[PDB]
Design a protein around this ligand. Structure first.
Ligand code: HEM
Ligand code: HEM
Ligand code: HEM
Ligand code: HEM
Ligand SMILES: [Cl-]
Ligand SMILES: [Cl-]
Ligand code: NA
Lengths: 105, 107, 107, 105
């Protein structure tokens, strides 16, 4: 599952793999530091922080360990179907989330 | 923060993804690392034992490093070793387990 | 097992030698390539960063690609891009650094 | 454009540049797979494997990074003064050497 993205518990991109660069069009340096919400169209884009926040409060997963086909958005605005799997992991008493993204095109 | 040296293995210890920073630290490119057992990145005897670490974790769900991390010793392609902090997370994709390893070089 | 596409640059990224298999792959004759910056064989953002990559190496002696290797994107004369594996070595001749890059087309 | 030859850790020619063809007379096809010692007169020709082996053993260079004027031998039997510079390269976990050959004639 080629394109990999790691975010912190606020949605901020920490790692952005070479497959993610080719899929999403953002260079790794550009993507790191940006909110992962840049990688999706509305309505998900404006809602994404809520999804993270809701998970952190509730611990109730919806995509983590479940996976879902969703719409992603390339740097150039174009949208594409993709499968999303997500994992969690802790470092320093903070969570980080790893996403694997499959371009269904 | 989280290290940028990241390694993804499947539930058989086979490297699936090997980040640029991991390439640099271990001295393998992803081209050569993908498909090899992650045990190539460590000295003996951990190397000979590592498949059992993974396999027994899968049957017991008793983690040792997962979620807490540990200072271990890594081995580069050229056989040189280094102290490293290892962080491991677990995930599921397509109903299969994968583990995400983050490595910080302590040289 | 070493690629037959081989490029040699000086310590300022300027192409010194361009093997026949580099010519095929990148679409430049050795005659046009020599004297140009190696950055012509790559897309942005690496292209406008490449001099800095070379100079950072000359400063730190800590390689990113030398002795490790990397999959990157190369760019042909015609503007089309391709996946490639890059290996790089360092040598010295007449007291100046030169870099020998070997390119494997991953298409 | 100077002549360029790549050999492996046992002195076997892996690449032989157009200028090396023009200079030494051997086509790249003919040169690849032969020992680099084909390109020199005696006694270097007989001793050359031992030069490579000592370098691999000791790491004490004599020409690598140093350069020397030596004599080179053409496919057609004739010899010629030449300057030699040698680099080391690792690819796929194994040593290669790159040689640059300046014809002094
Ligand atoms: C780029 C396309 C993405 C889309 C369209 C998307 C969409 C979604 C949606 C709809 C949810 C909420 C599920 C629900 O309430 O039904 C969600 C939750 C979440 N997403 Fe994203 N996401 C994307 C990328 C990512 C990536 C790449 C990561 C990690 C690096 C990530 C991390 C999370 C996390 C941690 C949650 C909360 C956990 C959960 O609800 O299971 N997302 N995402
Ligand atoms: C390269 C240097 C590494 C060394 C020296 C090393 C060593 C170890 C050791 C000694 C254990 C057993 C812990 C114990 O039983 O006390 C362990 C467990 C484990 N390691 Fe490795 N490891 C390394 C890299 C990695 C990486 C990069 C990953 C994932 C990509 C990984 C995945 C695992 C997993 C899944 C377990 C079982 C989970 C656990 O016990 O918490 N290892 N490792
Ligand atoms: C044509 C496609 C190429 C690309 C896309 C490329 C890109 C890069 C990148 C990404 C780095 C590391 C920068 C970093 O991670 O900070 C690098 C370093 C370097 N590259 Fe290039 N390169 C290419 C071709 C070559 C060639 C053919 C040579 C030699 C003839 C070369 C010589 C070097 C040197 C000397 C370094 C610094 C040494 C090091 O850090 O290991 N490049 N290059
Ligand atoms: C064609 C004419 C050549 C001659 C006469 C020649 C001669 C020599 C000599 C005399 C030495 C040993 C230094 C000493 O102990 O005095 C040497 C070492 C070596 N030569 Fe050659 N060589 C030739 C071509 C090449 C080429 C084209 C390569 C690489 C492609 C090469 C690779 C080496 C290597 C790797 C060593 C060991 C490194 C060292 O001692 O510095 N040689 N060669
Ligand atoms: Cl999944
Ligand atoms: Cl020299
Ligand atoms: Na950034």
């Amino acid at each position: 599952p080629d394109a990999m993205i790691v975010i912190d518990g606020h949605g901020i991109i920490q790692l952005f793999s070479t497959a993610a660069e080719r899929l999403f069009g953002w260079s790794e340096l550009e993507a790191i530091g940006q909110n992962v919400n840049i990688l999706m169209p509305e309505p998900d884009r404006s809602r994404h922080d809520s999804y993270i926040s809701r998970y952190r409060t509730t611990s109730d997963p919806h995509i983590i360990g479940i996976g879902r086909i969703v719409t992603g958005k390339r740097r150039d605005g174009t949208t594409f179907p993709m499968h999303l799997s997500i994992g969690e992991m802790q470092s320093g008493g903070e969570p980080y989330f790893t996403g694997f993204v499959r371009d269904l095109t």
